[PDB]
From a paper:
We therefore cloned the ScPat1C (473-796) domain, over-expressed it in E. coli and purified it in milligram amounts to homogeneity. The SeMet labeled and unlabeled proteins crystallized in three different space groups. Three and two copies of the ScPat1C molecule are present in the asymmetric unit of crystal forms II and III, respectively. The crystal packing radically differs between crystal forms II and III. In crystal form III, the two Pat1 molecules of the asymmetric unit exhibit a very intricate head-to-tail organization with an interacting surface area of 1,635 Å2. As this value is in the range expected for interfaces within homodimers, this suggested that this ScPat1C domain could also exist as a homodimer in solution. MALLS measurements on a protein at 2 mg/mL yielded a molecular mass of 39.3 kDa, indicating that ScPat1C is monomeric in solution (the theoretical molecular weight for the monomer is 38.6 kDa). Furthermore, the SAXS experimental curves measured at various ScPat1C concentrations (5.4 and 11.2 mg/mL, i.e. concentrations closer to those used in the crystallization experiments) clearly correspond to the curve calculated from the coordinates of the ScPat1C monomer but not from those of the crystal dimer. This SAXS analysis indicates that: first, the large contact area observed in crystal form III is created by the crystal-packing and does not reflect a biologically relevant oligomeric state; second, ScPat1C adopts in solution a structure similar to that observed in the crystals.
Hence, Pat1 is considered as a central platform protein for decapping. Indeed, the crystal structure of the S. cerevisiae Pat1C shows that this domain structurally belongs to the ARM repeat superfamily, which mostly encompasses proteins involved in protein-protein interaction. In conclusion, the crystal structure of the ScPat1 C-terminal domain has revealed two functionally important regions localized at opposite extremities of the domain.
Numbering used by the authors: 474 to 644, 654 to 796
Write the structure that this text describes.
């Protein structure tokens, strides 16, 4: 229960602080006490205690400090534990536009903190003497133990996937290359015909917009995901991707062009007030942003939107 997990987190901070005082005072560090404090090898509960800790702000806040006193095998086991349970985590449930269609500002902040800390940790683990087979194993754990599609309805799940595949791509035996093909295929099959769902619905965007007093959204992470999915696949995969997100391409082009006209009508006004000036700068920034993020994906496909057309590259 909640009071139990809170007591657990308290104990963990005490272990970390003792550990951190030792390292400062030059002397011995032994992470054995802190590791046990995590209850990572504890099957005695409904939800694993360490996992439940991750849905408290104070629990997630101590994760980097925990990783400072861990070896790679301990690091891997933790990430394995997490990847296993991803789509069940309370914070992921908060993160998905499906399970949480009307988040509060506070819930958005909790979500942002989680993905900020967790992603950085996962990234640093992959950037630090990590091999292909490690990454593959993590992707495969992700795919086989989760509703992959449900994960793609969260910024966190989407970002996690594109980090994993982009780290895969950025990297080797022939069986390893083949392993990547099998895994990509598994990932791809899990998403086939559900790709457009990565785009939250209009009701959700309107809600977020009203919430944050902002006329615009930021979906760079969505197009980034598509670009990396497309770059990691073969020509038939790319074909299937561009087909599933067809209407999103058109809608994006449509919005950009609507911005282009509003820009043209404000641009020719002399001595713009502060309000009109901030508005024009906003229009321009957002127009260019839609072009840029859309072209990140199209360029991968050998395509470009420029002067009212999707033309071939060069």
């Amino acid at each position: 229960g909640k009071k139990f997990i809170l007591e657990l987190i308290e104990t963990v901070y005490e272990e970390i602080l003792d550990l951190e005082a030792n390292l400062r005072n030059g002397q011995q560090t032994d992470s054995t006490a802190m590791w046990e404090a995590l209850h990572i090898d504890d099957s005695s509960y409904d939800v694993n205690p360490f996992i439940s800790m991750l849905s408290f702000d104070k629990g997630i806040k101590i994760m980097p400090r925990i990783f400072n006193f861990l070896d790679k095998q301990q690091k891997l086991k933790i990430l394995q534990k997490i990847f296993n349970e991803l789509s069940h985590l309370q914070i992921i449930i908060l993160s998905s536009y499906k399970t949480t269609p009307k988040p509060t500002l506070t819930q958005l902040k909790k979500v942002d903190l989680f993905q900020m800390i967790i992603l950085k940790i996962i990234v640093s683990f992959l950037s630090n003497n990590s091999n292909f087979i490690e990454i593959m194993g993590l992707l495969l754990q992700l795919i086989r133990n989760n509703n992959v599609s449900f994960l793609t309805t969260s910024k966190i799940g989407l970002n996690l996937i594109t980090i994993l595949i982009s780290r895969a791509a950025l990297i080797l035996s022939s069986p390893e290359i083949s392993t990547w093909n099998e895994i990509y295929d598994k990932l791809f099959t899990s998403l086939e015909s559900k790709i457009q769902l990565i785009f939250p619905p209009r009701e959700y965007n309107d809600h977020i917009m009203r919430l944050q007093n902002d006329k615009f959204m930021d979906e760079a992470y969505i197009w980034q995901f598509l670009a990396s999915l497309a770059l990691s696949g073969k020509l038939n995969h790319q074909r299937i991707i561009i087909d599933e997100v067809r209407d999103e391409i058109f809608a994006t082009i449509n919005e950009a062009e609507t911005l282009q006209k509003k820009e043209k009508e404000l641009s020719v006004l002399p001595q713009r007030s502060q309000e009109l000036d901030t508005e024009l700068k906003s229009i321009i920034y957002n127009k260019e942003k839609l072009y840029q993020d859309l072209n990140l994906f199209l360029n991968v496909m050998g395509l470009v939107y420029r002067d009212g057309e999707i033309s071939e590259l060069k």
